[PDB]
Amino acid sequence: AIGIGTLIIFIAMVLVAAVAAAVLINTSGFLQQKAMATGKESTEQVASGLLCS
Amino acid sequence: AIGIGTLIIFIAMVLVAAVAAAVLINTSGFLQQKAMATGKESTEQVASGLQVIR
Numbered sequence: 001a002i003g004i005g006t007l008i009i010f011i012a013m014v015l016v017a018a019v020a021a022a023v024l025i026n027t028s029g030f031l032q033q034k035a036m037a038t039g040k041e042s043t044e045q046v047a048s049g050l051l052c053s
Numbered sequence: 054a055i056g057i058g059t060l061i062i063f064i065a066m067v068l069v070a071a072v073a074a075a076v077l078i079n080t081s082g083f084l085q086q087k088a089m090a091t092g093k094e095s096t097e098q099v100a101s102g103l104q105v106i107r
Contacts, residue, residue, distance in 0.1 A: 004077070007084045011091050018095045025099070 001077075003081060004084065007081075007088050011088060014092055014095045018099060021099045025102075
């Protein structure tokens with residue numbers, strides 16, 4: 001009797017961990033974009049300019 | 054004589070207990086595959102991906 005239930009709830013544990021992992025993976029992706037963008041943009045700003053002759 | 058019935062009902066009792074046992078053995082089989090697959094698949098999903106180099 002006991003065995004049956006153990007299997008079923010095991011399935012849930014798997015899926016719930018999977019769903020949580022998805023958040024972390026995705027979020028890391030979402031941040032990767034902006035992280036890079038900010039650095040490149042900021043550098044180009046500080047480095048560039050014009051000078052009156 | 055009372056003995057006669059006692060024998061006959063025993064035959065039934067055995068048979069019923071067999072049928073009852075069977076369903077658990079069968080169901081455990083069904084669940085085995087479903088569980089194992091669910092774990093494997095879920096693992097591969099998290100573990101894998103692609104990365105844009107340039």
